[PDB]
C-alpha cells in the first residue's frame, strides 16, 4: 500500500544506537495497544525512524489482514485537516483518521507554531487512546523541547515509551552498507567498504549516496571496485576540526606572523594587533577555556585576553575594511 | 512544449568532461525513478546542465507519451509558490507539483536563504519520494557547499547520485563547435575551428559566441572565413596567468627600478622600498610558496619578507597616496 | 508609443564605425528572435545606440501588429523593479516584463552595484531567451569591463552577436549634417557644413548643437548662412598634440635658461632641476618611449632617466608648490 517495501524489520540493522529504539517498536508490532500504546520516537535525521515504522505497519497489516493502519506525516495531516475545513470535509476527516487501528505519524516537530491542527490531532490522540488503539508518533526532538506545544500534547506525549536514536557505529555502518549492497546484487571488497564506512559518517543516507555513486563510477570506468577506485570517486564528496594550533597556523598564513612574536611580549601596535585579532577570533570559535586560551597563548592572564577582545569587537562595531578582513579570515580558514 | 528542441542527446557532444553526467542522465532516462531517483548535477556555467534536463526530458516524453514530465527552474518554483501562498491556491500548486512523474528542477542554490521555501520543496521531494517518481536537480555547487540549507535537504540531495561537470578539452572544444557549425548549415575551416577553441576556454556559451561573431563579421565584409578573418572578427572579443618574473617587470616599469636591484644586499629605503612593495604585491596575487618567492628575491629569509609586507601592511591601512599608487599597479599589472 | 519617431533606419547615415552594427540590428529587425537572439551593442555617447535600438523596435512594430516590443532604460528598470518589490506587487512587474515579444533594455552598465536589480535581469533574461523572444542590450563599455556584473549575466551578454561603435570620420559627419538639415527644410551651403564637421568631431550631439547655433545666430541676423557667418556663430563654441619640443622650451622659459643647453652635458643645479622637471613632465603626460625621449636628452641613459625620474617623484611627494607649478605649466600648455 502506503508502506515502502524496502523498510522492514528484516531489512533492518540492529545496532547499539538504535537496539532500545528497534526493540520498543518490534514489541509493539507483536502486542498493538497493549505494551506501549504512546509510542514516541526521535533522533537525527537520515537515522532510521520513518523505516523502523514502516516495519511496524508491514508487521502489523502480515500478522493481521484486517488491521487499518495508517501511516502519514504531520505535513500532510495540517494539509488534509485545512482542506477538510475549507470544503466542509470535516466530519469525513474524523471518520477516517479517528478509526484506525495503528497510527504513524512523521515529524510530528511540523505541528510547532500551528494552534489548530494541534488541538485537532490532540483530540484524534485521546480518542484512539480511549478506543485502545495504538498511536506512533516519530519527532527529531524530544517531546519537552518541541516549542508552541501545549502542556496537554506535551503530557500525552510523555505517557508512554520514549525512544531514542543515535548516529551510527563504523561497524553498524559496514553491516548496513553490506545489507544494502547483499540486497542490490552487487559484490564489492571489505577493504572498499571499510574506506566508504570511515569516510562518510554524519547520516545514513549518505552512506547509501556515496556507495551507490562509487558503484556507479566503477561502473562506467568498466573496472571492478577497489579501494582507489573508491578514494578517487569519493574525493569531491569528502569534518575539519580546528585546533588552537590550527588557527594560529591560519592567522600566520593569512596575516603570517612569525610563530614566536605572539609570545613575545613586545607592546608595539605593529606586534599587538595580530595577537588581540586571533585572540578574539580564538575565543569565538574555540570551546578552550580562557585560561588554557592564554596559556598557549604566551601564557598571558584572562585579563588581557578580556580586553583584547573587547576592544576588538568595539572596533569591529563601527569600521568596516577590518571587518572585510576578517570575514575573509573566518571565509579561508574553512 | 516546455522543453527546448535544440537541447537534446543527439546534440550533446560527450568528452571527459561530461561523460559520467552524460551517463547518469541516459541512465535515468531509460529507467525513469528506477535507476537513481534524486539525481544531482553540478558544474559550473555554460556547462551543459540544461541541454541534459532537457534531453532526458525529451527521452522519457518521447518513450512514453503519457507521462507527466516537468521542467523548471527553482526561481519559477518559488514564485509559483509565493502566488500560491498569496492568491488562496496552494492546493492547486500542490496538485500541480506534487503529481509530476519527473520533475526537473534547475539551479537549486536559489533556494539558498528562503526557509518557507525550501520546506516547501523539502515536503515536495518526499511526495514526488514516496509515491516512486525521479527527480532530477541541477545546481552551481555540491548540497554540502550551498549556504542556508537545512540539513534534512542536503542529506536528502546527497541521498540519490551526485555527479559534476568539467569545462570541456580542446578537442571537445572543436568538436561542438563542428556541430555547432554543421547546425547552422555552413562550412568553416578546421584552422578557424582550431583558432577559435584554442583562443577560448570559458565555456560554451562564449564558443558560440565567438563563432557567430566570426560568421557575422564574415557576412558584412563579403570574404571567406580564414584564420587571418577570425582574428580580424574576435579582436574585441578575446586569461593572462601573473608569474612573479611578470610582476617583477611590472613593478620595474612602473617604478623602473633595475632587475639586481631587488636581488642587492643595500639596506638603504630608496633601495629597499621597492623590494617589498614588490614582495607584498606577490604575495597578495601569487600561488607560490613563501620560501620559493624568498630564494627568488634575492635569496632572502622568510622572516624579514615577514617584517617587511606586514610594515606595508601598516603604512597602506593609514596612508591613501600610496593606496592609489597599489591600485595602479594592481590595475596595470593584469 | 515609448519609441521615437526621429530615430529610424532611414534616418540613420552608415559610415565605417557603424556600417558592422546598422548591418547586425537590421538583420535582428528582420528576423527578431530567430537570427541573433542575445544582440549587445556598445558604444561612446551620441554615437546611435538608441536610435538604432528605436529602429529596429520601430521595424518589428511596423512589420507585426501582432509583437509586443518594450524598450526601456536600465534605470526605468530597476525603479520599477524596486517599487514593485516595495509595493508587495512584484508578479506585475514579472508578467509585463518577460511576456514581451523584443526587450529593448538600454545603458545596460548602470545595472553595476545593484545586486538584486541584476539578479531580476537575470531572470528575465533567462525567461525571455528560454521562449525565443529577442534581446537587445546597449552600453557604453563591453560586457567584460562592466564592474560588479557576475559571470552568469555576462556569459548571457556574450552569448550571441557583439557589436561595437566607432566615432564617425568626416564624410559621414558632413552626410549626418546634410541629412538633418534636408530633414530640417533648409538650404545650407556644402562650405558651412564641411566647416562644422571639421571644427567639431565629438558625436552626434555637439554636431546638431553646433548647426543649430548656426541656424539660429544666423536667423537672427537674418543673414543666409555662409562660412564667415557660421565661423562667428561658432566662435564661442570651439585636443593638441603635446609635443616634447614644446614641453623643454615652456619649462626652460619658467625656470631662466635658454633652449641649446637642454642637451648640453653641465651637471649644474639650476640647469639640472629645470631638466629633471622638463622630463618628469614628459613622463607623465605623454606617451613617447623612454628611448626616444633619451635621444631627445643628447642620448641620456635608461638609468638616469630612471634615476631623475624616481628623484623627481620622490622630491614632489613631500611638497605642495611644487605640484602648483607644474599644474600652472600643464594649465598653460593645455
Ligand atoms: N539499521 C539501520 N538504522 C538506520 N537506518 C537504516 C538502517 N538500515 C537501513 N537504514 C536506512 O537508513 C535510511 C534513513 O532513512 P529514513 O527514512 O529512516 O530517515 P529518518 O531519519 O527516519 O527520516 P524521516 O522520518 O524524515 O523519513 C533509510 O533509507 C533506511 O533504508
Ligand atoms: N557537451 C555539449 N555539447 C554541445 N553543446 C553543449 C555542450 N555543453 C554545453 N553546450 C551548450 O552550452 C550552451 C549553454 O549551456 P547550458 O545552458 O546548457 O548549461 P549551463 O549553463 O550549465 O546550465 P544552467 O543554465 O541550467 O545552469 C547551450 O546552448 C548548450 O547547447
Ligand atoms: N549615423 C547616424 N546618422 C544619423 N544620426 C545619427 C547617427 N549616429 C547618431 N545619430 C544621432 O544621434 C542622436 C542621439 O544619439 P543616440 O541616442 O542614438 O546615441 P547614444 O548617446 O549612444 O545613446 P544612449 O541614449 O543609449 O546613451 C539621434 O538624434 C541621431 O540623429
Ligand atoms: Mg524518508
Ligand atoms: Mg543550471
Ligand atoms: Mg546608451
Same mark, same amino acid.
Given at each position: 500500500?502506503?508502506?515502502?517495501? @524496502?523498510?522492514?524489520?528484516?531489512?533492518?540493522?540492529? &545496532?547499539? &544506537?538504535?537496539?532500545?529504539?528497534?526493540?520498543?517498536?518490534?514489541? /509493539?508490532?507483536?502486542?498493538?495497544?497493549?505494551?506501549?500504546?504512546?509510542?514516541?520516537?526521535?533522533?537525527?535525521?537520515?537515522?532510521?525512524?520513518?523505516?523502523?515504522?514502516?516495519?511496524?505497519?508491514?508487521?502489523?497489516?502480515?500478522?493481521?489482514?484486517?488491521?487499518?493502519?495508517?501511516?502519514?506525516?504531520?505535513?500532510?495531516?495540517?494539509?488534509?485537516?485545512?482542506?477538510?475545513? $475549507?470544503?466542509?470535509?470535516?466530519?469525513?476527516?474524523?471518520? $477516517?483518521?479517528?478509526?484506525?487501528?495503528?497510527?504513524? #505519524?512523521?515529524?510530528?516537530?511540523?505541528?510547532?507554531? @500551528?494552534? *489548530?491542527? *494541534?488541538?485537532?490531532?490532540?483530540?484524534?490522540?485521546? +480518542?484512539?487512546?480511549?478506543?485502545?488503539?495504538?498511536?506512533? #508518533?516519530?519527532?527529531? =526532538?524530544?517531546?519537552?523541547?518541541?516549542?508552541?506545544?501545549?502542556?496537554? %500534547? $506535551?503530557?500525552?506525549?510523555?505517557?508512554?515509551?520514549?525512544?531514542? #536514536?543515535?548516529?551510527?557505529?563504523?561497524?553498524?555502518?559496514?553491516?548496513?552498507? $553490506?545489507?544494502?549492497?547483499?540486497?542490490? &546484487?552487487?559484490?564489492?571488497?571489505?577493504?572498499?567498504?571499510?574506506?566508504?564506512?570511515?569516510?562518510?559518517?554524519?547520516?545514513? =543516507?549518505?552512506?547509501?549516496?556515496? %556507495?551507490? =555513486?562509487?558503484?556507479?563510477?566503477?561502473?562506467?570506468?568498466?573496472?571492478?571496485?577497489?579501494?582507489?577506485?573508491?578514494?578517487?570517486?569519493?574525493?569531491?564528496?569528502?569534518?575539519?576540526?580546528?585546533?588552537?594550533?590550527?588557527?594560529?597556523?591560519?592567522? &600566520? *598564513?593569512?596575516?603570517?606572523?612569525?610563530?614566536?612574536?605572539?609570545?613575545? @611580549?613586545?607592546?608595539?601596535?605593529? /606586534?599587538?594587533?595580530?595577537?588581540?585579532?586571533?585572540?578574539?577570533?580564538?575565543?569565538?570559535?574555540?570551546?578552550?577555556?580562557?585560561?588554557?586560551?592564554?596559556?598557549?597563548?604566551?601564557?598571558?592572564?584572562?585579563? +588581557?585576553?578580556?580586553?583584547?577582545?573587547?576592544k576588538i569587537?568595539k572596533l569591529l562595531a563601527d569600521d568596516?575594511?577590518l *571587518?572585510?578582513?576578517?570575514?575573509?579570515?573566518?571565509?579561508? %580558514?574553512?
Open positions: 500500500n502506503m508502506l515502502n517495501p @524496502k523498510y522492514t524489520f528484516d531489512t533492518f540493522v540492529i &545496532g547499539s &544506537g538504535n537496539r532500545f529504539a528497534h526493540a520498543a517498536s518490534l514489541a /509493539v508490532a507483536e502486542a498493538p495497544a497493549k505494551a506501549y500504546n504512546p509510542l514516541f520516537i526521535y533522533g537525527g535525521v537520515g537515522l532510521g525512524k520513518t523505516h523502523l515504522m514502516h516495519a511496524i505497519g508491514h508487521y502489523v497489516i502480515d500478522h493481521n489482514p484486517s488491521a487499518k493502519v495508517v501511516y502519514l506525516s504531520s505535513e500532510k495531516f495540517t494539509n488534509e485537516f485545512i482542506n477538510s475545513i $475549507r470544503d466542509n470535509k470535516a466530519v469525513d476527516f474524523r471518520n $477516517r483518521y479517528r478509526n484506525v487501528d495503528v497510527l504513524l #505519524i512523521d515529524d510530528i516537530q511540523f505541528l510547532a507554531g @500551528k494552534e *489548530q491542527t *494541534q488541538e485537532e490531532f490532540f483530540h484524534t490522540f485521546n +480518542t484512539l487512546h480511549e478506543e485502545s488503539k495504538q498511536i506512533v #508518533i516519530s519527532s527529531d =526532538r524530544p517531546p519537552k523541547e518541541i516549542p508552541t506545544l501545549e502542556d496537554r %500534547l $506535551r503530557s500525552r506525549f510523555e505517557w508512554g515509551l520514549i525512544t531514542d #536514536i543515535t548516529p551510527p557505529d563504523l561497524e553498524t555502518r559496514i553491516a548496513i552498507l $553490506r545489507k544494502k549492497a547483499k540486497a542490490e &546484487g552487487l559484490d564489492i571488497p571489505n577493504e572498499v567498504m571499510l574506506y566508504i564506512a570511515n569516510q562518510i559518517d554524519s547520516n545514513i =543516507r549518505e552512506l547509501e549516496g556515496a %556507495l551507490i =555513486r562509487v558503484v556507479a563510477y566503477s561502473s562506467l570506468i568498466n573496472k571492478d571496485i577497489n579501494a582507489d577506485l573508491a578514494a578517487e570517486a569519493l574525493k569531491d564528496i569528502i569534518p575539519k576540526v580546528i585546533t588552537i594550533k590550527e588557527i594560529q597556523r591560519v592567522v &600566520g *598564513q593569512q596575516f603570517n606572523i612569525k610563530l614566536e612574536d605572539f609570545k613575545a @611580549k613586545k607592546r608595539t601596535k605593529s /606586534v599587538a594587533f595580530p595577537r588581540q585579532i586571533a585572540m578574539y577570533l580564538s575565543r569565538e570559535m574555540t570551546d578552550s577555556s580562557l585560561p588554557k586560551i592564554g596559556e598557549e597563548f604566551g601564557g598571558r592572564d584572562h585579563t +588581557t585576553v578580556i580586553h583584547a577582545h573587547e569587537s568596516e575594511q *571587518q572585510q578582513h576578517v570575514k575573509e579570515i573566518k571565509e579561508q %580558514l574553512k
